[PDB]
Curated annotation (Swiss-Prot), chain A:
Phenotype of the disrupted gene, per the record: Hypersensitivity to reactive oxygen species generated by the redox-cycling agent paraquat. Reduced sleep. Flies sleep for one-third of the wild-type amount. They perform normally in a number of tasks, have preserved sleep homeostasis, but are not impaired by sleep deprivation. They also have a reduced lifespan. Males are able to discriminate between males and females during courtship but their courtship of females is reduced, suggesting that their perception and/or response to wild-type female pheromones is decreased.
Known tissue expression: Expressed in mushroom body (at protein level); this overlaps with expression of qvr/quiver/sleepless and nicotinic acetylcholine receptor (nAChRs) proteins also involved in sleep regulation. Expressed in the adult brain. Enriched in the mushroom body, anterior optic tubercle, superior protocerebrum, antennal nerve and visual projection neuron fibers projecting into the lobula plate of the optic lobe.
Species of the source: Drosophila melanogaster (Fruit fly)
Name recorded for this polypeptide: Potassium voltage-gated channel protein Shaker
Described function: Voltage-gated potassium channel that mediates transmembrane potassium transport in excitable membranes. The channel alternates between opened and closed conformations in response to the voltage difference across the membrane. Forms rapidly inactivating tetrameric potassium-selective channels through which potassium ions pass in accordance with their electrochemical gradient and may contribute to A-type currents. Plays a role in the regulation of sleep need or efficiency. Plays a role in sexual behavior, where it is important for male sex discrimination.
Domain free text: The transmembrane segment S4 functions as a voltage-sensor and is characterized by a series of positively charged amino acids at every third position. Channel opening and closing is effected by a conformation change that affects the position and orientation of the voltage-sensor paddle formed by S3 and S4 within the membrane. A transmembrane electric field that is positive inside would push the positively charged S4 segment outwards, thereby opening the pore, while a field that is negative inside would pull the S4 segment inwards and close the pore.
Part of the full-length chain shown: 2 to 20 of 655
Family of this protein: Belongs to the potassium channel family. A (Shaker) (TC 1.A.1.2) subfamily. Shaker sub-subfamily.
Swiss-Prot record, chain B:
Span list, region S4-S5 linker: 207-220
Topology Extracellular: residue spans: 243-256, 277-283
Domain free text: The transmembrane segment S4 functions as a voltage-sensor and is characterized by a series of positively charged amino acids at every third position. Channel opening and closing is effected by a conformation change that affects the position and orientation of the voltage-sensor paddle formed by S3 and S4 within the membrane. A transmembrane electric field that is positive inside would push the positively charged S4 segment outwards, thereby opening the pore, while a field that is negative inside would pull the S4 segment inwards and close the pore.
Assembly and interaction partners: Homotetramer or heterotetramer of potassium channel proteins. Interacts with qvr/quiver/sleepless (via loop 2 of the three-fingered Ly-6 domain); this interaction may stabilize both components of the complex and may be required for targeting to or retention of Sh/shaker in neural cell projections.
Segments carrying motif Selectivity filter: 269-274
UniProt intramembrane annotation: 257-268, 269-276
Protein's name in the database: Potassium voltage-gated channel protein Shaker
Top-level division of the source organism's lineage: Eukaryota
Function noted in UniProt: Voltage-gated potassium channel that mediates transmembrane potassium transport in excitable membranes. The channel alternates between opened and closed conformations in response to the voltage difference across the membrane. Forms rapidly inactivating tetrameric potassium-selective channels through which potassium ions pass in accordance with their electrochemical gradient and may contribute to A-type currents. Plays a role in the regulation of sleep need or efficiency. Plays a role in sexual behavior, where it is important for male sex discrimination.
Shown part of the complete sequence: 84 to 489 of 655
Tissue spec: Expressed in mushroom body (at protein level); this overlaps with expression of qvr/quiver/sleepless and nicotinic acetylcholine receptor (nAChRs) proteins also involved in sleep regulation. Expressed in the adult brain. Enriched in the mushroom body, anterior optic tubercle, superior protocerebrum, antennal nerve and visual projection neuron fibers projecting into the lobula plate of the optic lobe.
Outcome after substituting residue 91 to R: In RNA edited version
Family: Belongs to the potassium channel family. A (Shaker) (TC 1.A.1.2) subfamily. Shaker sub-subfamily.
Subcellular location per the Swiss-Prot or TrEMBL entry: Cell membrane; Membrane raft; Cell projection, Neuron projection; Perikaryon
């Protein structure tokens, strides 16, 4: 496939995932 | 839009277990009822020695509770606490059933299985599977014995439907309409095809199938966008590949519609098979078609994926 | 770069509903105008009894407001509050039209507007575009005046709309009608009859999602170029490898490295070549490596484009 | 469910390095033992001059500590600090082994060792496993005693290792040696020769990634079943549609609905069927729909499986 | 591991613009130098009237600064502020060059440059590399001295650039010119005419994305090995299954398990084998299982490499 998985359910600069 | 209070009667102090809050009394007066809105439900928490409001509860969650008074109708949960604790904090002050519902939005044994209907359900699942098997087997070249099982399955289906009496009922009706129809060959082929809809009766018994249905209902727009992108790509690349090969003798593609299928099996990376009789320009067009197909499939699908993931975790 | 104040005249206290802030007046006087910059707009909130500034508002959002004075020009939204509260909070103090505008970037004539019962014009235009596409595809069929009349009616409608209207939309509008007027070596004829397909892009003015796709392409041109570069590198490398794996065998499947290019593509994008038997063991190993590397090089750059498309779609 | 105390005995103040906390003594007395639960372990931190509890440690993580007393048994780490700081934060107050253990779930025998003399045994074992796999795949060749000796040496080594050792690893080891002893209807012979391939799974004992894959499969059995169910639904539906599209045309490509199943599969997974010419326009439309729906149905459940694999992989490292 | 101070000399108060911090002087005594470590660099901030330390700076970021003293060696940026502001905060107090450096890791000779006269040299090198690749591809054509002159001009330019310049870049530059001088058993000839393709890797010096890809591969070599291992296991298993499905059938499509190996691959990667008719029902079932397992075993390892590439690409810009 090409999606290879999720996009992270949100990708913003200084996102809460990276916080 | 919500209304915020403006300064200039007397200001009161709130002590949430050491976190001191000071607000105008008019701000607390804005919302009637509620623990802090009226003096009747808050006089117990008064401290005569300190003239302070003492609320020995979670400190970080009082900011949102006060902000509801501050914003005069806007209640948003800050990202510092789980949702479980916030639901408990809001219930303490009794903000109001209508206010809590905003964040909420943020015989007959067949539906409710209770011991004995836990079997009826398994019999229904077995009968649905048996009907599917009979359908597939009777389509075989090697093949009354199938008709008897089919009519037994239909009798069970209609018995369940008539005892029961959205979309489940519609599917149940559709699963038995073609059998009663049999009691231009294009119509016959169409009804024999729509006989396959009995496979969707597993939605009543499969939790994942209902999740998929809800995901489709939620992301109809994204599905339409994906179909539109695919259609545009197919038209463009089929036209390009047809015009890249029209000038050669014994052209592989007779017309642009004849190339449509090819375009599809190149955008979805299914593959067409034989590809030799197409020249260099056709090969370049095919490479571009493959790349654009990967992009146009990877673009909108993750939104539907996200919707399905959310619905799956909400169910469990 | 921004400048911050340094200590050594008098300090003042700011009470944001119980959250006391103490800052040097030199910091407060750094920015002229504004609610806190000048004494005229902040004397109203002064408390003569306690010599304190009272601002009965959202406590957690004042940290960014003070930090803007602290950093002397840097205003960043902390990740603790929704966007709605921050936008309203900054408007309360009137930080400045330029300051708020800078933060915004951190995150007849009836045709263009589909209002005043002009949606009928839009649906007629969409129907004409679809009819033109269908007529083009059907006239490419081998089975075929009747098509020319419909095509020229569509061209008259398109040119009437373009002339009454008078960016990329206008360029597409012009290109959609150039080839018809051109026809009033055969390679140029083939090119113009191919570029006639650009009428499919006329749906951009009416389809919101296709504009999102165009904006995503504009934003991720760099990633698209990187993906094309990676695909070219992989195709060249694996085509050379597979061709040299068959050099020593008679009746070679691939006559030359360029001949293998197409094959590499359908292995890099996992589309499929079809017949694969006359390839030896070394060619099969090279093909497996090509498939894996193509999967890798396709999966590497597509998430960026997917994220851009998702961001644009959910911002729209 | 947890119980929270309600107000009306004496109130005390807690000073976490300047961050003042005020809490009723009844809330503090709810939990016995612990640094703050009993006067024995908290009188040392008393300040006679100010009548205050002084705790010169991390300010932001004390909110969860007090909330544990506030909720009377509910302890969750707020998302403002790393896990390392919060893990050591609890150990200071000694809330209890059971409380800490509950939070943990919120986020000869010379062979099973890593000694210098044990790595050689491991490398010999993995070499023997690889040699057995190679011998299998070579003895299946058309061109072919020499293989039997190598196979019996590998079997002897496997039995010796199993006997020295004496879940699922032992089951795999048993299966890897059963067929050789079995040889000492042709369908049974074919089945045993097929199950001989399970020797490849013995690499799980020596491969860290393979155990991660096994744990991921065990965790996501439900998602795997959902994916299989969706595939089955799609295959049945699209095979039936494509068969009935060619019902009215002579020389039908698909003789029956089951015959089309394979086709449906290699269209849902985008593998590809190959020749497609004798199929009419309706069959092509059904095939396009099948390809799109297969892409969607294979894309839907795999995020959960890959997230589980990511979680297990990062937990291992 | 870090050491935390314990209570029982004098306590001091820190007023970070209204946020009062109270800590033991021993905690401030733990780290020498620094603005707060020694009286010399902090006396200016003392307030004689209030006996307090006043720092008119950011309030939310002082918690990490105090925790460095609190934890005695641990500095973690709390997730409430961007890295830009926190980088300036640590510089204000001058925690120490070693402390700041440790946190950094937590998150003529004109040819190797970019000036007005170096740009033309770079564009010339890129053009020469592209020309060499084109000459290679066209000299492999069946329709064909004229190519040798262009080849030797490219080689002279390559060796001139290498000599002027004088890791991995120099290795690639060397390998790009070894085969030309080698020419001055046909297996070695085939190997050298194959390794001539390495000239295409010289574009790394001029392409920023290619270096990002190389860094991603270096970082995720472990994940690449895991993916290769999973593919090998799946190929062996499914080749064995599909071969033994046709073992008892006459006119078997697959002669041996290695013969089926290729098939397995083009089913795990969903490339497609092509003709599939002569395979029976059991072979088709095995093929469907192989397709599903290949989808799974490809979707599992790739996202880690995807994350590494995204991180490197966004760190570059
Ligand atoms: K594919
Ligand atoms: K394929």
């Amino acid at each position: 496939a090409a999606v290879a998985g999720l996009y992270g359910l949100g990708k913003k600069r200084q996102h809460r995932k990276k916080q």
